[PDB]
């Protein structure tokens, strides 16, 4: 094994490679949403900027996991990034709802990784997950939940969507 590998279980190594792929997939979905909201027949620059930032954020999640893999002496094995399930995302509300669903799927996968890590007694990996991932996941789920509630209060369509979009820009 690697000259640095210590207390690093193969199941944790494999699960991190899967998490890297999932993070990159979530980044690709948000990129799709970002440019969907800059279509001339959609034109929601606030939503676009929100998802463009989420897209950068999830790519840096993936990169932190790749760096982690190397830190522990595992092997990065990259897999194909699936195309987003949609190419057209609907109203701003439906995009937020699909985003909230994606964030909770990511959160679930992250909690399964934490359970794998505790089960193999890897305090370094559980710490990583708690400080670098689980905390941000709960914040973004709270933020997206808040946004859905406000957008339903404002609209969710027509003038209320137009105004709510402004608070994101």
Binding-site residue ranges for Fe cation: 23, 58, 61, 103, 137
Which 110-169 residues touch a copy of itself, going by CB under 8 A?
111, 114-115, 118, 121, 123-124, 126-127, 129-131, 134-135, 138-139, 141-142, 145-150, 153-155, 157-164, 166-167
Residues 6+ apart with CB under 8 A from 125: 12, 72, 113, 117
Closest approach of a copy of itself to the CB of residue 107, in Å: 6
Which 58-97 residues touch a copy of itself, going by CB under 8 A?
63, 66-67, 69-73, 75-84, 87
Q: Does 53 bind a copy of itself (CB under 8 A)?
A: no
- Both structure tokens of 10: 């193969």
Which one, of 58, 134, 128, lies nearest residue 99 by Cα? 58
Tell me the C-alpha distance between 86 and 79, whole Å: 20
């Amino acid at each position: 094994a690697s000259q640095v590998r210590q207390n690093y279980h193969e199941d944790c190594e494999a699960s991190i490679n899967k998490q890297i792929n999932m993070e990159l997939y979530a980044s690709y979905v948000y990129l799709s949403m970002a440019y969907y909201f800059e279509r001339d027949d959609v034109a929601l620059p606030g939503f676009a900027k929100f998802f463009k930032e989420s897209s950068d954020e999830e790519r840096e999640h993936a990169q932190t996991f790749m760096k982690y893999q190397n830190k522990r002496g595992g092997r990065i094995v990259l897999q194909q990034i699936a195309a987003p399930s949609m190419q057209e995302w609907g109203t701003g509300l439906e995009a937020l709802q699909a985003a909230l669903d994606l964030e909770k799927q990511v959160n679930q996968s992250l909690l399964e990784l934490h359970s794998t890590a505790s089960g193999n007694n890897d305090p370094h990996l559980t710490k990583l997950l708690e400080d670098e991932y689980l905390e941000e996941q709960v914040d973004s789920i709270k933020k997206i939940g808040d946004m859905i509630t406000k957008l339903k209060r404002a609209g969710p369509t027509g003038l209320g969507e137009y105004m709510f979009d402004k608070e994101l820009n």
